[PDB]
Design a protein around this ligand. Structure first.
Ligand SMILES: *[C@@H]1O[C@H](CO)[C@@H](O)[C@H](O)[C@H]1NC(C)=O
Ligand SMILES: *[C@@H]1O[C@H](CO)[C@@H](O)[C@H](O)[C@H]1NC(C)=O
Ligand SMILES: *[C@@H]1O[C@H](CO)[C@@H](O)[C@H](O)[C@H]1NC(C)=O
Ligand SMILES: *[C@@H]1O[C@H](CO)[C@@H](O)[C@H](O)[C@H]1NC(C)=O
Lengths: 348, 101, 348, 348, 347
């Protein structure tokens, strides 16, 4: 009765499904919202008002986070939550800036903590977690924004840390990134480079061997923001290029078929500022070797509305799974717009 | 590191590194009151007292922005500071203060 | 453990049972309310505030739909929901007016969409759905309000569209049809004509053969609003008559006995404006061939209150079913007055 | 798994247990509050605002009846509710004054109605009901307050009325009767007289023979309000005496032991007005034949608070039952002070 | 399916875990908050606001709103824990010199106990410890400035069974905080208002139903106000100077396979209630050892007030976590809850 990957439900294109807008209707102040779905329910996690008021809350998806509906979990500024198969797991970090401390909340009782190593800032995905076979996988980093912030993978089971994974290769900057089960054997991520490169460092995780390799994506569509013009960086794939300063988390979600894997992406429509979302797709191939452009597949949010932090996640169906992608919008309380894969034809 | 230098009639606010595409530039004169700002998308904002008299032009290639005066008034005599504040809290770089002219 | 038709519980005449009036008492703005009853509970559905703002909600019947109690289900403007036997199913339509699309919410995961064909307006019953043997039957139409709006049936199982039904006969305008299980082999409906006829077009569905036929209700009682004087339309029974412009949704519910079927109708007391409700009954006979007048059987709402769209539904008892009929009253938030069949005697 | 009487838990004297005061802390306006306890929970029933708006509500006992915490049930002005063994049963009366109507809510689907006979005023206990062996017994009267208001006993099973009982003897006025299970063989009641007698007419019900007999209490402690001086009525037990005008419902509860039955009563401390509550007890004996004085056993409410409508009930324990008596306090929203038999000693 | 003691989950040092601060956001007025955790849920009990005070309970993690709180009883002294299948409650009410204790078991009220010294009646104002269907509590009766003898009660299935009379120096004992030291012994940590500036130590033997009260021989005088540490000469039972006044103290166990540790807390300030800080000791006999406590962290700095503290345990699936909490006031109460997790140093 655990959690295992399966095949995705049939479909061709994303369609709008829902939105939660507490600004319209005692709403809280929430930021960095992320959603993980268990076998029976989904919770809309968030962070309320770094300071000592930063708490991790959760309301059932579909419900606006009121004061009486929101259950507090922990005092942290960087959250993560998923379902190992039987009950909920949570991760959060707080403390002093230079000496931060990670926390685990499993079932109802607090279990374990982990300390910092590079002694600058310790932080996690700020999104959901991916757990397979009772071994739940997370990513944490420690270092500087303008320096080196090397990342580590965590292997937690029943609320207890088991193993740490050290990536190999170009590992000089990685932070703030969603992940998804590409397959049973290989698990991917899509991350953010703040200073060096205006691209997304692509991480490959193997659950069987517990090894990580980080390579930059060779495609022409530079998904990060701010970005230069597409296809303006010459040379090999690992060339950082110009205007690599700055970054933002980007959506990323899989599409599991019988004998083929498709990949959805997203980015900002604007080149420099964060005004509006758009969705761009690629079918199959090697991310580390293919420089072909992503196929445009719709306008996600119009340019008159702000497209901030986005996430990627899955909702569990009876016999399959649905890949759904969501976006946060700000105004400083946040709304969410949640889009799922559904039907066929063309996106409106 | 990265610093801002002012040499300005023509003004030049030269910067090092790659802060020209992520930080919001401004001009402050000397109380401390707004003069001129630009963004990284081309949008230009100016103070109410200085409508239609300031022209701002940037150069992404070599990391220096320009400012030009027309019909100078005696009331404009001040020391002008070019700064590089970051509009986003998610960006972990601070504002840098130039020496000014 | 599915949903099947059964016999109706004994009784003679309808009696007042409940009313939910948020206007007396933060209540939302609700319009087009309907209720579908599961094996153990009933929810008072609604549509909160035809633009993108409109959402579908649901609170348990008996509860005033507050902000805390309301569960947001989807973003649509035309709702439908029922229980196939195990868990809830919902339908709603959103998009551009000329190129809208249908949506399905099954369990917690989104499944499928259906597009437009006449490319003018897409809409559904704005009422409940009837589901037998896991094969749930719905109605959508596409076309012009003042022109031709051809209608179709749906056959959805486990949340997936399976089969489509094309009705035969006079189909030139048909929408907003309230339907009930007349029998195991036949499902009927009661529709509304906007432009042509001041009557209700009668639909018959056959679950075995998936064939639909649309004919006009042949009686002298003109159930629609606005209407002419009763019995003023001469000639053959398919004669349209005068003052066929305008229309309103009408309540309609069956009464299943061992060897006899009766029908309960409702209509506005006023000839022109939508003010006041009644109840008019007929025992047996063929609606397509009988021109006999409806038997007056009570006054539902006095002439001091407005009667907007009504609906018909069934509440599930342990061993039988109770045919109840409900009315919506407005002032611009709506109430809901719910009448059930109980006892004997005469309606007060 | 039904509701059967058992022996009462050991205990000597009542002690204060709880109070619900919505006035201190949007609380509703409630009057005639009563409570019935099922196998696992107790619901604090009440009636909100003989107009055409009054509804029957229910909150879990211990909770302040807010607008969100209260589920509506029905639209009546006289409520009664108890647990037949598996689910809840409700009774209420509505309609016009002269042509009133009673109606039942069972499970979630409404079942049955019964009409008036004396065609003046229809009403019920305005308190809880007693159900044994799936046959729930209620008491309903019809007539005039200043004239003759004969009472009937109603035997409802699974939401359907089975049999009616016509009492034998002096039945010229009987209303607002509070009842409890004296034993399996006999159910008793305690009533109120409005105009004739300043005493409480005692009713004995037999479940096996379905026969009712109504006589007056022969004891010297006149339990009604207003009342004359104690022992001022000469002659036999049935002498109505003077100052029989007016009346109020009085608390009454049994106490089931292995080989002995004790009775708790209550009455207003004042002789004329509704102000002050006390408790007066008698051990065994025949109420229809004994003129012995009641044994004073404490003060329920001090001299500075008003004591309105009172009731008696039982809370279900795992292995026995606890006889509790409550009192409603007014100011025009009502509170509820609940006292239970608890330990030994003397009442504070 | 009942409650039994087990071994504590591994961990070296406490870390901050949660805080509930209703003052920041219709919150009630709560005082003396305590938490007892059942097999599946933790309840944050409290006393709302002279013949009106009620015992409430909200699920731990939530904030006590008017809608979210269920009232239980009308008392001014709280106690609740889980006997194995359902909840148990204790409260005390009545006239001050003639008070009454009452029990709420499951959903139906069961039993009462009267006063004996007929001056003041009160209980722990904290949780209860229940083993094998026999739940054990404390009643004290008497004067604050005189003699207030204490008793231990045995309640099973909501009914009072047996009473325990302690032996020894019993002239003042109240507001005792307790925990399962072992299967055969329950300890407590108490407060002396008038006589001693230390904490009287109680040992309860569940097998024989005997109690003994002795004083703490260590130099760390945990009470507030306190004199300088190690300023009391002679034996362990010498009360010394400035025995007037007192406060409740945190106390929680740490059960290992072959060793028992003890966690204490006390005020950082020597005189007034301002700031908490953990102090620990590993093993030894409290009644005979006079060695100093091991300083092991700072809970609350001197800029925030440290009022009543409690000690409790959250039930994990395979073990238990010893967590300690503190009440902070402003007169609405905010609760900060620390648990034992990981290793290293307390921040
Ligand atoms: C992965 O393993 C699970 C075992 O539970 C199996 O059901 C599934 O088909 C496998 N493959 C994928 C792509 O999930
Ligand atoms: C219809 O079919 C169901 C099969 O479940 C049967 O129980 C029922 O008696 C049939 N007839 C009616 C009128 O429902
Ligand atoms: C009445 O019948 C029930 C049926 O089990 C029995 O338990 C009870 O002892 C009987 N007597 C009384 C006084 O309830
Ligand atoms: C106490 O007894 C229980 C029996 O249920 C046992 O499991 C436990 O190991 C014993 N010891 C402790 C320290 O709890």
């Amino acid at each position: 009765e655990w959690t295992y990957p399966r095949l995705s439900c049939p479909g061709s294109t994303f369609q709008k499904a829902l939105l939660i807008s507490p600004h319209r209707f005692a709403p809280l102040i929430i930021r960095e919202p992320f959603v993980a779905c268990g076998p029976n329910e989904c919770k809309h996690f968030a962070l309320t008002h770094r300071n000592k008021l930063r708490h991790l809350i959760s309301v059932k998806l579909g419900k606006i986070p009121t004061v009486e509906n929101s259950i507090f979990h922990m005092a942290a500024w960087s959250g993560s939550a998923c379902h190992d198969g039987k009950e909920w797991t949570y991760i959060g970090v707080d403390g002093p800036d230079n000496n931060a401390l990670l926390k685990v909340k499993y079932g109802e009782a607090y279990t374990d903590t982990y300390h910092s190593y590079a002694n600058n800032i310790l932080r996690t995905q700020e999104s959901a977690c991916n757990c397979i076979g009772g071994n739940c996988y997370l990513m944490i980093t420690d270092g500087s924004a303008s320096g080196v912030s090397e990342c580590r993978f965590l292997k937690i089971r029943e609320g207890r840390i088991i193993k740490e994974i050290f990536p190999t290769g170009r590992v000089k900057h990685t932070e703030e990134c969603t992940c998804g089960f590409a397959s049973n054997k290989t698990i991917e991520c899509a991350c953010r480079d703040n200073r060096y490169t205006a691209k997304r460092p692509f991480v490959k995780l193997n659950v069987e061997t517990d090894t990580a390799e980080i390579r930059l994506m060779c495609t022409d569509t530079y998904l990060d923001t701010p970005r230069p013009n597409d296809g303006s960086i010459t040379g090999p794939c690992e060339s950082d290029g110009d205007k690599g300063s700055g970054g933002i988390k980007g959506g990323f979600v899989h599409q599991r078929m019988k004998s083929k894997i498709g990949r959805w992406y997203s980015r900002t429509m604007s080149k420099t500022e964060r005004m509006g979302m758009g969705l761009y797709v690629k079918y199959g191939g090697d991310p580390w070797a293919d420089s072909d452009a992503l196929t445009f597949s719709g306008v996600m949010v119009s340019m008159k509305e702000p497209g901030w932090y986005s996430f990627g996640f899955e909702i569990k169906d009876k016999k399959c799974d649905v890949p759904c992608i969501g976006i946060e919008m700000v105004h400083h309380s946040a709304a969410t717009a949640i889009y799922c894969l559904m039907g066929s034809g063309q996106l409106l | 590191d990265v610093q801002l230098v002012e040499s300005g009639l023509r003004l030049s606010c030269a910067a090092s590194g790659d802060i020209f595409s992520t930080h919001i530039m401004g001009w402050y004169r000397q109380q401390r009151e707004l003069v001129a700002t630009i963004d990284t998308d081309g949008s230009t904002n100016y103070a109410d007292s200085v409508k239609g008299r300031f022209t701002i032009s940037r150069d992404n290639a070599k990391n220096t922005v320009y400012l030009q005066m027309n019909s100078l008034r005696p009331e404009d005599t001040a020391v002008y500071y070019c700064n590089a504040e970051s509009a986003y809290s998610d960006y972990r770089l601070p504002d840098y203060w130039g020496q000014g002219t």
